[PDB]
Design a protein around this ligand. Structure first.
Ligand SMILES: COc1cc(OC)c(S(=O)(=O)N(c2ccccc2)c2ccc(N)cc2)cc1NC(=O)CCC(=O)O
Ligand SMILES: COc1cc(OC)c(S(=O)(=O)N(c2ccccc2)c2ccc(N)cc2)cc1NC(=O)CCC(=O)O
Ligand SMILES: COc1cc(OC)c(S(=O)(=O)N(c2ccccc2)c2ccc(N)cc2)cc1NC(=O)CCC(=O)O
Lengths: 222, 222, 222
């Protein structure tokens, strides 16, 4: 029953400790499947490992993380309250806190995913960053790309899903909508707030912006 | 004191186990009020139940959830780190992870609320979806509606709050602002990135989009 | 080892209880550094205190919070799953749930930060509110300001970071992009969805909006 399975958790935690994993609290750790690990792995409180998971050397997992059927490279840092399912992280990635990686999430070396970011069937290239308030679905994102806060892939049209491709060295300004299918060429810049409905050339700016105007002495409702 | 109340928690957890609830860890469960439940209910670690809560049959509650004064229908799945207060879920709803339902949140049968979604005094209809990065306040949303990632109800003008009504079979494109009060007719489509300031007719597209343009050889600051 | 350090945690929790702090579960509390507190402080389950932290009187900390090197004024309420690092809260602030305050976050008296909000090197003035789905970086925000859902400071141009200044009594409509450096004068109103690329005068409306239009009988892909 509940109590018996809980005892089995204690057993796994003890064995992990003996195998050289640093568990901050063995009473607040759960493994529901199998865990392979390198050396100097640190796991904080209330972490749940599900399915078949492998961790490299020096991986640090912060409080409250849920990691299911995932492969985590050496030196990765997973910050608090991050949920990871069927994902692969290369070496030296940093994700979270409050990141949500869904199946097909693939991060290349040194990639960063910040708070309130969701990834599904999406690859984030080497040294690339998606720091805030972003949804990346059905997307290929190249190396050295900056995905600005509020960026969203419009991948689903109510019927089908379509693919977004972003080249290397692209800057995606904040609050950009990438309307799939679309391709953004290497070195391109998307202006903040752009709705990208057409492919963008290499080294080109894409923009869809009304010039700002001002009305004086404008009074809000009382 | 602290320790005495903690003992009372152990008691409630034990009684829940005896009554047929599956608690993954009775030592990491809190009930501060009253819990009614059906059969085959599963509650993961670090769940807190507050006030008066009722759960149907086969409800699954993932790690770290906080559920206060709420009614949860049969077969609902509440994913990790979801906060629910004074809400009602019909049968077969799926919410979270990282969903925040505030008082007046009402989900009809089979509704879905995803990550980084907040609902307050808002009804989400049958089979309707709000999957990502969305705020729905003071809103009626019909059946079979797709609420795209980044959608926001602009409900508060600094003085008062106003109501948004969205009909059945509406597609709301990503990053739409619904400027209340506003009504979107059944079958309508809102283009991604639209600022909806006027009512939308049945079976109509609403759009407010600058055509994309491109400037070649555009160099970002060094 | 793990077990020894865990014993030291039990010790600190016991001492906190004896010093008049209400810990909901002393077995689910962690202090990694030093904690100073006033009277009637309440700390819920799975809270982690890191570095050197000071709390005023009547501070309430909800489940799962992580508070590092921060100063929390009297009567503050920190809601569940909120991460706070190198921040200062004045009296009577309310933050979270799912708020993420990074170093340099400074909240003045009675300020509110809601769910899925991130702050970094940003000051939020007296009685000011950032309730939802927002990133505020490198920003000064005055008193009695409403920061609408979906607001983002565009602070980083790929090379450098720039400062946003928002005056007192400003209403920032939902989904506004503040393109730094920029200054918004006292009493100004930013329309929902505006991309603010130019300074805004006192008591002025700033807007960058395509008028909504409609196409009848528009059929989505099958
Ligand atoms: C200071 O930061 C910016 C300035 C700026 O603008 C100052 C523009 S812009 O998009 O308006 N823009 C631009 C883009 C890249 C580099 C420099 C400027 C731009 C585009 C076209 C025109 N005509 C003017 C500015 C964008 C940003 N920053 C972001 O979008 C942040 C992304 C993130 O969250 O990491
Ligand atoms: C591929 O996905 C889209 C394509 C598209 O566009 C391809 C438009 S659109 O809005 O630009 N658009 C449209 C809308 C619905 C169905 C098909 C197209 C549209 C509207 C007007 C015009 N003239 C062209 C396209 C929107 C989306 N998707 C979303 O908005 C995702 C919502 C979510 O997160 O679930
Ligand atoms: C009902 O709420 C609104 C109405 C409205 O609009 C009704 C506009 S508006 O921006 O379109 N607008 C406006 C702004 C402030 C007060 C009243 C109206 C506005 C601006 C210019 C013009 N011409 C018309 C309306 C904005 C809001 N609300 C928000 O943006 C919510 C912010 C939040 O999340 O707290």
């Amino acid at each position: 029953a509940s109590r018996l399975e809980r005892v089995y958790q204690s057993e796994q935690a003890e064995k992990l400790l003996l195998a050289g994993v640093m568990l901050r609290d063995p009473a607040r750790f759960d493994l529901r499947g199998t865990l392979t690990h390198g050396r100097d792995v640190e796991i904080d409180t209330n972490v749940i490992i599900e399915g078949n998971v492998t961790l490299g050397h020096r991986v640090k997992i912060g409080t409250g993380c849920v990691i299911k059927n995932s492969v985590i490279g050496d030196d990765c840092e997973i910050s608090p309250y991050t949920v990871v399912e069927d994902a692969n992280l290369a070496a030296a990635c940093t994700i979270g806190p409050f990141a949500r990686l869904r199946p097909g999430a693939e991060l290349l070396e040194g990639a960063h995913v910040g708070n309130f970011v969701e990834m599904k069937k999406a690859r984030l290239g080497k040294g690339s960053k998606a720091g805030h308030l972003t949804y990346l679905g059905d997307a290929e994102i190249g190396d050295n790309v900056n995905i600005g806060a509020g960026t969203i892939t419009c991948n689903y049209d109510g019927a089908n899903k379509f693919k977004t491709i972003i080249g290397d060295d692209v800057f995606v300004g904040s609050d950009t909508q990438l309307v799939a299918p679309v391709t953004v060429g290497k070195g391109a810049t998307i202006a903040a707030g752009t709705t990208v409905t057409r492919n963008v050339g290499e080294n080109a700016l894409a923009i869809s912006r009304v010039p700002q105007t001002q009305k004086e002495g404008w009074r809000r409702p009382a």
